[PDB]
Amino acid sequence: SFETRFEKMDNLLRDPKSEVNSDCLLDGLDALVYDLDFPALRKNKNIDNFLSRYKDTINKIRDLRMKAEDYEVVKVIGRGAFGEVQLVRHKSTRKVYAMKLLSKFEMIKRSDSAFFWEERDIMAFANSPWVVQLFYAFQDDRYLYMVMEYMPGGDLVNLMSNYDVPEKWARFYTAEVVLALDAIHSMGFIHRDVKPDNMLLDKSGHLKLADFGTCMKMNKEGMVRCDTAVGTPDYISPEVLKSGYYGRECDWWSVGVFLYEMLVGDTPFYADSLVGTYSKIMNHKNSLTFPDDNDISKEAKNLICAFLTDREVRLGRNGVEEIKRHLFFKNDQWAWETLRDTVAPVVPDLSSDIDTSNFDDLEETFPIPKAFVGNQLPFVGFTYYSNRRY
Amino acid sequence: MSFETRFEKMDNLLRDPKSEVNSDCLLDGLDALVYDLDFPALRKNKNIDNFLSRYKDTINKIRDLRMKAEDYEVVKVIGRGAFGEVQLVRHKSTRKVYAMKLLSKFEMIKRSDSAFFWEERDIMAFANSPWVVQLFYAFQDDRYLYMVMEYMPGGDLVNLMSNYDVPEKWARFYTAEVVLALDAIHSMGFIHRDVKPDNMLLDKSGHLKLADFGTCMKMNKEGMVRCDTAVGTPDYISPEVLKSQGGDGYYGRECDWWSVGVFLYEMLVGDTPFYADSLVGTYSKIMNHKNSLTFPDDNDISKEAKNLICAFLTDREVRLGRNGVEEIKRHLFFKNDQWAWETLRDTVAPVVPDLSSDIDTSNFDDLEEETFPIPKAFVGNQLPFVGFTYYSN
Ligand SMILES: COc1cccc(CC(=O)Nc2nc(-c3ccncc3)cs2)c1
Numbered sequence: 001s002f003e004t005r006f007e008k009m010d011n012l013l014r015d016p017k018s019e020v021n022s023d024c025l026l027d028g029l030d031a032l033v034y035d036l037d038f039p040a041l042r043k044n045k046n047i048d049n050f051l052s053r054y055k056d057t058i059n060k061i062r063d064l065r066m067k068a069e070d071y072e073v074v075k076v077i078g079r080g081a082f083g084e085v086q087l088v089r090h091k092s093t094r095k096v097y098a099m100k101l102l103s104k105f106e107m108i109k110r111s112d113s114a115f116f117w118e119e120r121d122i123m124a125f126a127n128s129p130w131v132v133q134l135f136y137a138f139q140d141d142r143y144l145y146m147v148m149e150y151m152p153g154g155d156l157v158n159l160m161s162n163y164d165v166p167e168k169w170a171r172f173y174t175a176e177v178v179l180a181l182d183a184i185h186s187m188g189f190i191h192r193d194v195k196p197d198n199m200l201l202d203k204s205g206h207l208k209l210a211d212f213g214t215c216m217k218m219n220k221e222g223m224v225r226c227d228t229a230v231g232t233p234d235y236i237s238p239e240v241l242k243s244g245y246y247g248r249e250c251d252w253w254s255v256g257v258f259l260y261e262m263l264v265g266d267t268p269f270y271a272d273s274l275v276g277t278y279s280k281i282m283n284h285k286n287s288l289t290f291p292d293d294n295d296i297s298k299e300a301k302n303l304i305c306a307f308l309t310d311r312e313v314r315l316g317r318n319g320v321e322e323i324k325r326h327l328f329f330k331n332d333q334w335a336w337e338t339l340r341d342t343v344a345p346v347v348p349d350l351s352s353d354i355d356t357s358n359f360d361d362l363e364e365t366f367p368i369p370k371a372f373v374g375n376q377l378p379f380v381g382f383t384y385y386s387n388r389r390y
Numbered sequence: 391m392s393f394e395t396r397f398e399k400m401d402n403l404l405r406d407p408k409s410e411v412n413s414d415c416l417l418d419g420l421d422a423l424v425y426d427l428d429f430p431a432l433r434k435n436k437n438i439d440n441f442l443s444r445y446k447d448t449i450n451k452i453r454d455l456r457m458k459a460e461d462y463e464v465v466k467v468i469g470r471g472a473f474g475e476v477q478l479v480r481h482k483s484t485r486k487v488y489a490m491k492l493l494s495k496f497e498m499i500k501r502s503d504s505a506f507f508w509e510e511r512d513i514m515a516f517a518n519s520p521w522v523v524q525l526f527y528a529f530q531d532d533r534y535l536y537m538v539m540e541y542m543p544g545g546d547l548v549n550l551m552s553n554y555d556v557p558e559k560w561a562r563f564y565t566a567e568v569v570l571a572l573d574a575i576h577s578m579g580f581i582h583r584d585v586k587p588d589n590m591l592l593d594k595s596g597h598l599k600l601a602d603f604g605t606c607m608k609m610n611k612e613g614m615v616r617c618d619t620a621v622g623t624p625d626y627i628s629p630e631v632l633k634s635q636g637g638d639g640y641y642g643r644e645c646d647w648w649s650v651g652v653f654l655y656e657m658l659v660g661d662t663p664f665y666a667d668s669l670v671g672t673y674s675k676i677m678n679h680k681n682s683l684t685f686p687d688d689n690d691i692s693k694e695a696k697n698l699i700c701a702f703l704t705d706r707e708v709r710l711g712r713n714g715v716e717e718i719k720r721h722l723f724f725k726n727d728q729w730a731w732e733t734l735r736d737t738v739a740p741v742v743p744d745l746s747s748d749i750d751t752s753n754f755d756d757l758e759e760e761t762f763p764i765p766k767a768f769v770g771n772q773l774p775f776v777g778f779t780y781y782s783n
């Protein structure tokens with residue numbers, strides 16, 4: 001029907017999950033205006049006139065929509081592969097957030113992924129206390145910005161480097177990681193890179209996963225067919241490393257590595273060279289050993305080994321409930337169903353809404369195109385602002 | 391401004407039918423990009439290939455869901471112009487009857503001229519006057535621009551004039567309606583420039599509406615408009631608009647009154663006052679209006695009409711209407727006992743069309759497609775038409 005058509009077409013500009021919603025549409029025009037404003041291209045009149053026409057309009061759009069200058073940068077709280085994360089304060093709302101910047105130039109220069117796409121979707125729509133939340137996603141001619149809730153507790157790498165983690169704490173953190181990974185698996189994703197670096201702590205000391213750079217969607221039979229290895233050298237599972245066809249079992253390998261590192265102090269397959277770490281991983285059968293540690297309980301050693309085995313015998317091959325049922329978790333302080341409502345082992349004592357004490361101390365683009373390059377095309381639709389899921 | 395205000399303002403901008411960035415214009419921008427990039431030479435670039443491959447399934451859905459030409463059943467081609475053809479159509483679903491002006495995108499780009507249609511769209515779309523033909527929908531594709539208007543079954547004034555020796559009483563009515571119609575356009579901030587009987591359309595009731603606002607242009611701070619554009623068929627063109635060629639020339643609304651005088655002349659006399667075989671001869675006669683304007687030796691034209699014709703067929707500086715419409719309105723030619731200016735369109739028109747159906751084309755005379763070459767690099771042929779789409783409610 002004529003009505004049906006205009007209704008169906010209408011829901012398409014509203015749906016935050018739609019490829020053609022106002023957010024993508026605005027981005028698309030904003031992209032064209034950016035990718036064409038060069039003298040060599042402006043020599044063509046169709047181009048010159050189009051730009052000259054939308055000049056006054058596109059600037060209004062640019063000022064009205066979310067821009068980076070809307071945020072006052074408090075401190076650079078982190079640095080990664082393709083950009084930097086920063087504690088910011090939205091100048092108008094005076095609200096405090098953690099903002100992940102991703103250099104559009106850097107990614108384009110042999111990025112090979114489009115990794116930020118599921119990183120956006122997961123954070124934007126997860127709706128889990130276990131996933132860091134995306135409030136706004138916006139861009140410009142140089143970067144991709146992710147405006148997420150700030151985790152003042154810092155990461156697990158910081159906790160571990162400041163405490164000799166008692167088993168009682170390791171139990172809590174491991175358990176929370178199990179709940180957190182399960183949530184991601186339920187969303188249909190395999191995390192592919194579970195490490196302390198991605199474990200973040202809130203105002204209350206409770207866990208959230210961040211940086212789903214490596215996330216991939218599981219197929220019909222809960223598998224991923226990635227022909228190349230993905231992850232971190234110590235936490236990588238041997239199956240992922242060799243590749244390949246694999247399942248969620250790989251994220252449990254990583255849990256075992258994390259449990260080991262917390263209680264032992266080092267990674268189970270650590271070796272001088274990164275190649276030596278790879279070697280030790282492939283020989284997990286004979287390389288996994290425990291020091292003379294009267295502290296590491298029989299159950300913990302069992303759990304570590306139940307996760308640090310070949311995929312086919314891994315704890316978690318038959319689901320989370322077999323991990324949950326493990327005696328290591330048997331305790332009188334929390335129940336799985338209410339674990340995040342219990343009181344954390346390390347409650348952060350914070351000085352302000354901008355206390356950066358749990359984050360270590362910290363502080364070029366594409367050339368002018370000869371012809372049409374379309375450098376801003378692979379980022380059309382990244383904006384999460386005009387049409388969001390409230 | 392607050393963050394909230396800033397969000398809300400940006401929201402109203404995707405809703406406003408008067409906005410350059412409302413959802414329909416934005417859809418156009420993407421639709422254009424998809425059309426202007428789907429070529430193998432450009433697809434050699436991955437940024438391009440991936441963008442297209444990504445939006446492929448989406449853009450097709452958009453194409454079928456949005457208003458298309460195949461939504462309309464063409465009844466008869468009711469007209470033909472320079473860059474396309476007008477046609478009486480019936481919307482297949484609603485079964486509603488409209489006039490549809492088609493414009494060839496290839497022809498417009500080919501002939502340099504590709505922007506006249508803007509002021510035509512806006513005027514018809516937003517005028518909201520009984521004097522302006524109404525635009526209900528404006529839509530496009532890789533080949534044409536489409537304007538879906540209300541059908542004027544009464545036909546044009548050129549047809550009326552060719553079928554009747556217009557009595558002065560009728561000419562008074564038609565002239566008066568044209569004055570009200572032009573005033574409405576001027577009020578909107580536009581000068582028509584080349585007014586003529588061809589642009590005077592008659593409704594189901596025989597009342598007037600202006601159409602074909604191609605030559606139309608928006609006035610500046612001082613109610614003036616500057617132009618370079620070479621203008622053909624000078625018969626109704628004012629000597630100031632003719633003088634203006636190359637950008638040398640700023641003129642006002644006074645030029646549309648010149649054309650009224652030409653129309654009043656043609657109705658009562660039977661021919662155009664400056665008609666000559668060649669178009670150059672018509673131009674020559676216009677520039678020499680002072681000595682070329684003459685009336686035939688038959689007592690038939692009334693003194694008032696002659697004065698009015700001459701009051702409009704003078705140099706800009708002394709033209710009736712240089713001091714506003716009220717001085718035209720006050721002219722003795724209009725002095726009558728049949729209508730009042732304030733209620734003229736509520737009166738019973740001199741020629742009421744007797745029509746056979748909702749598709750009666752009796753007042754409209756009886757009536758290879760070149761294609762764009764493939765481009766080695768980015769041509770952007772679709773860009774001058776981004777945002778032409780408009781829907782009503
Ligand atoms: C992929 O290239 C980068 C660029 C910058 C930083 C990183 C590491 C990273 O992904 N860092 C994240 N940090 C948070 C965070 C930090 C503090 N509070 C809440 C969330 C969420 S993801 C990777």
Ligand SMILES: COc1cccc(CC(=O)Nc2nc(-c3ccncc3)cs2)c1
Pocket residue numbers: 468469470471472473474475476489491492493523539540541542543591601602603604
């Ligand atoms: C130069 O570009 C063209 C292309 C096709 C036709 C024309 C002439 C024209 O502009 N003709 C019009 N006719 C109506 C109309 C006719 C009947 N009923 C309602 C509207 C509105 S504009 C010009």
